[PDB]
Amino acid sequence: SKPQPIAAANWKCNGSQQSLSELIDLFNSTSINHDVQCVVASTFVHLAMTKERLSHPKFVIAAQNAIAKSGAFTGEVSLPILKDFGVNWIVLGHSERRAYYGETNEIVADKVAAAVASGFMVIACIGETLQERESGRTAVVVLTQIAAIAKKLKKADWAKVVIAYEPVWAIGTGKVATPQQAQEAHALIRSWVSSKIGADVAGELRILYGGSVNGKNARTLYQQRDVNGFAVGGASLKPEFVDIIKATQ
Amino acid sequence: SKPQPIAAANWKCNGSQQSLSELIDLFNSTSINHDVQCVVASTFVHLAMTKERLSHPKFVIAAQNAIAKSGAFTGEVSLPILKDFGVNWIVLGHSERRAYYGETNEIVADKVAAAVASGFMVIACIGETLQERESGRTAVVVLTQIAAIAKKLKKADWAKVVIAYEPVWAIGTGKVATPQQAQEAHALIRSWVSSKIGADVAGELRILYGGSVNGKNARTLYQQRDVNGFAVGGASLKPEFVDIIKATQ
Ligand code: NA
Ligand code: NA
Ligand code: NA
Ligand code: NA
């Protein structure tokens, strides 16, 4: 059966002190009685307050990015700084950083490896664009992305790895990905991990859906065989994130 | 009379909670009896603790980077987020971001203009590399970089602008940039601002030296016509930064 599900809130580059404190207390108010790891990835600026306001025992705090080492990298935040700050979860390789901020497969893979080596739980993001999917390259791109990461890890490292599949191809179109399309990509990923890493690793690996999800379709997405939770974008800044948490049963 | 000097501590991608707390309290302990604006640019993660713990009336806090607007930019921090956080100073266009993180003259310029329009005091960084200075292209590069910024601003915006000259060319060689080399580059910048923006603007503008500054050479560097302080790298993480402050008297 499925391993422990994860409900991750990627706030992206958003938030004010007052609005986040209120959303934080909403999360604090939620009764969560099943086994699920909830994650809040705030901006670097808001990590201190999120550490301070978020008291729900099923929640942990994550960063949205880092570089591997401290030093002369003005504007960036390193893994040791986050570790010293009590942050033990991190999102790496998000489609927005791959598109805007120069993160090639190799750059993502080296960050993921460094984060695992530093003791982090890592939500490593993969996924293909619309031009890639329409040209028949979904499997090429997605398995290239994860192999680039895998080649920098050891088998035991995967206990600290979570995969988030982003259907980047669905943005801008008039139709979100279907649950069947989501399950298709998740099943492809898990099949690859079983074959190249190990069936034991594949059975314990969490593969999170990273497309648009709301309280109405989250339950159906989680009902899919190879879906272990969500890495949520805009809905994670809203009260309906609670309904997404509840959709992980 | 020179305009009010600035002593800016660019901590870059460095710091732990305990070591920054002690450094902040050292800064807090300093007796500063002349008109100078001290600036601490910490990592995003440490902005909260620097806000809480830095109580010296001559100090303000700064970010080391930002993007212009909030939205779907995972890992980045925007100007509105920093403004909501009470951060009113920012370093933009640092040579490390130009080299490593794709910040062209245009990208730097658009960030500077957005930060000024949002109410920020901006330390805008310019400077030429070794290959550029060896090519006899110091004036070409520095004046191109500042013209790219200036054309996105109006004359009154310069009341919120500080220029930091970085002698990138000096790193890696065995020769320290001399005080006279620093002064000649500042005079070039000052002369250009006078001609293209206005003599009034040039007289009020703070041009900070952003090379290797320490407690031993800071006074010699400051006692030059067109140097108005410093944007300090490694020494700003050390008690020596206090002597750099004193050198601006
Ligand atoms: Na709160
Ligand atoms: Na609170
Ligand atoms: Na259903
Ligand atoms: Na279902």
UniProtKB/Swiss-Prot annotation, chains A, B:
Organism classification: Eukaryota, Discoba, Euglenozoa, Kinetoplastea, Metakinetoplastina
Binding positions for substrate per the UniProt entry: 10, 12
Family: Belongs to the triosephosphate isomerase family.
Gene Ontology biological process terms in this record: gluconeogenesis; glyceraldehyde-3-phosphate biosynthetic process; glycerol catabolic process; glycolytic process
GO molecular function, one term: triose-phosphate isomerase activity
InterPro entries named in the record: Aldolase_TIM, TIM_sf, TrioseP_Isoase_bac/euk, Triosephosphate_isomerase, Triosephosphate_isomerase_AS
Biological source species: Trypanosoma brucei brucei
Miscellaneous comment as given in the Swiss-Prot or TrEMBL entry: The enzyme contains a high proportion of positively-charged residues in beta-barrels V and VII (compared to the homologous regions in other triose isomerase sequences). Since 2 clusters of positive charges located at precise distances on the molecular surface are common to 4 glycosomal enzymes, it has been speculated that this might represent a signal for entry into glycosomes.
PROSITE patterns: TIM_1, TIM_2
PANTHER family on file: TRIOSEPHOSPHATE ISOMERASE (PTHR21139:SF2)
Any one annotated GO CC term: glycosome
Catalytic residue positions: 94, 166
Keyword annotations of the record: Gluconeogenesis, Glycolysis, Glycosome, Isomerase, Peroxisome
Catalytic activity as recorded in UniProt: D-glyceraldehyde 3-phosphate = dihydroxyacetone phosphate
Superkingdom field: Eukaryota
Subunit structure: Homodimer.
Pathway(s) the chain acts in: Carbohydrate biosynthesis; gluconeogenesis; Carbohydrate degradation; glycolysis; D-glyceraldehyde 3-phosphate from glycerone phosphate: step 1/1
Name of this protein: Triosephosphate isomerase, glycosomal
Coiled-coil ranges per UniProt: none
Subcellular location(s) per record: Glycosome
Pfam family, one: TIM
EC number(s) given by UniProt: 5.3.1.1
Enzyme's top EC category: isomerase
